[PDB]
């Protein structure tokens, strides 16, 4: 089955084989399709198909609701009708069959998504938000006009929201192990802390296992242990912006006596049921208004250290120990001991079924 959309005038119709285009880091699945035109009533004699990657986002200074500013991050256009002699491209397996079914009035088009591009990520809107989704979302636009610079008509264009998604790698990586050693003032004996997750790659809804090992040799007593999972998102529109948001926190009242060890296993699970009110949280790309899980981590192109546009989502696990206060310095010093454990949170590669849109609709 393929997806088709028709213009309000009915003269233009475009066919897409899918809506999610998997990103393999080094290569991206091509965006192929077929455009059906009727030149008898079409006097413009030119048909243009445009793929656009835009960072749609609201405005706080403007009091108008719903209005957003559109900033294109990647724009590519290919003209289908009339067939361009220079734009000769091979036909995919699905593309050739669509031409045969429709007839001789259907012409193909094919785009190549370049690498080092953002994935479809939609920030969670607030309760008072009534406009379109905010974030990065691709779009396939088809229209007929005399020239590119000519004004576009609402009745003479079609648009489909497509997605660029990534899935969990087949090969697991090294186990994330991080340790710290804090040295105090009263005594030279250190306060050791170790933490290690079970595996690097976790799935959406799969529990996260944290192993905590505390080797206390100082004179102070640890009061509370805080374990949290935080979502790190990087936005690069005009300047790089870093912000954090905890999606799952669990506090334990475990107390470690001086000159004693400690060992425990903690289980955490990030989910959207308790994070509904956290405005600004990053979620996977929505089509229109569907419910989507937390944004999956983005697989960066090795250690290229490039400034990727759009939104880059990453996760970490923080283990924090609360140390008792008092003594000489009182409540002025900061004796808390913390350590961070990065991990990857994605989806397994689906076998046949692509991601769907609210399968049991209300």
């Amino acid at each position: 089955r393929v997806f088709k959309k028709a213009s309000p005038n009915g003269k233009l119709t475009v066919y897409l084989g899918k809506r999610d285009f998997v990103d393999h880091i080094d290569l991206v699945d091509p965006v192929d399709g077929v455009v059906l035109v009727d030149p008898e009533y079409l006097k413009e004699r030119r048909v243009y198909v445009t793929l656009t990657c835009a960072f749609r986002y609201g405005r706080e200074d403007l009091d108008v609701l719903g209005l957003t500013f559109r900033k294109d991050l990647f724009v590519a256009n290919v003209q289908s009708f009339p067939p361009a002699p220079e734009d000769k491209k091979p036909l995919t397996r699905l593309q050739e069959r669509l031409i045969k079914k429709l007839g001789e009035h259907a012409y193909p088009f094919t785009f190549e998504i370049p690498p080092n591009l953002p994935c479809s990520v939609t920030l969670q809107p607030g309760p008072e938000d009534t406009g379109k989704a905010c974030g990065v979302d691709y779009e396939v636009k088809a229209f007929c006009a005399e020239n590119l610079e000519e004004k576009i008509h609402k009745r003479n264009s079609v648009r489909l929201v497509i997605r660029k998604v990534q899935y969990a790698p087949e090969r697991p990586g090294p186990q994330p192990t991080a340790e710290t050693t804090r040295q105090f003032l009263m005594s030279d004996k250190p306060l050791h802390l170790e933490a290690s997750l079970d595996k690097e790659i976790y799935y959406h809804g799969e529990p996260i296992s944290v192993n905590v090992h505390v080797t206390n040799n100082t004179n102070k007593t640890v009061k509370k242990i805080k374990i949290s999972v935080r979502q790190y998102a990087d936005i690069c529109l005009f300047n790089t912006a870093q912000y954090k948001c905890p999606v799952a926190m669990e506090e334990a009242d475990d107390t470690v006596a001086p000159s004693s060890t400690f060992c425990k296993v903690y289980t955490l699970t990030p989910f959207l049921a308790n994070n509904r009110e956290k405005r600004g949280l990053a979620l996977d790309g929505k089509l229109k208004h569907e419910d989507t899980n937390l944004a999956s981590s983005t697989l960066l192109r090795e250690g290229a250290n490039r400034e990727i546009l759009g939104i880059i989502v990453s996760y970490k696990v923080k283990v924090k120990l609360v140390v008792s206060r008092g003594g000489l310095l009182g409540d002025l010093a900061s004796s808390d001991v913390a350590v961070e454990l990065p991990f990857t949170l994605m989806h397994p590669k689906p076998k046949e079924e692509p991601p769907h849109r609210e399968v049991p609709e209300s």
Partner: antibody
Amino acid sequence: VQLVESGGGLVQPGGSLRLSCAASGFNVYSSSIHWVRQAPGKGLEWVASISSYYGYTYYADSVKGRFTISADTSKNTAYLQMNSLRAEDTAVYYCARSRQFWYSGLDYWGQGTLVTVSS
Amino acid sequence: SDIQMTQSPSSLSASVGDRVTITCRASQSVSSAVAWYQQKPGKAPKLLIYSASSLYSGVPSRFSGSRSGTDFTLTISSLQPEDFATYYCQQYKYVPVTFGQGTKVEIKR
């Protein structure tokens, strides 16, 4: 991996019952747990559903307002609280599980529990 | 909205090695969100097909499904002796999830 439920039995009409489905082998955040009842000699019917990831619960129109479904994530168990049971509610109740990402049918089913409502 | 899934025939009989076809009709378009189950008497239903064409893992390849508009068909190539049970039709596109009436398959004498 196995779904086992307990709590069925004979209850007078207008009473209450508690069905507990102790899911083993998977969690409740990555799986959506459904309850399906089958009347003696009749076809299957869907009564309740819970999605712990999005915090959404659904009920059939016949059992709306009388049946309450909830999940205890601590021990991976889902409960079905029934109130004001009637004679037509006698059936065999099955506990079913479906993938949260994404729905692909009720692949895992419970062994079945029998609920009889008679005066 | 509610969807009434009319499953025909109500019951049929066939011999071993016969090709058996079962028709499931939906009152409204449900895309390709249809699943098939097999429930032997006394046991829990077993999932066979999901998305109306994808065979579930561990199911013998003799089972197959097809879609044509709103008509969904479950076809068994060779009627093995262990295929004699009741088959139900399901749709999971709209809440509530509605099942079919069920079809009984028995030996022929």
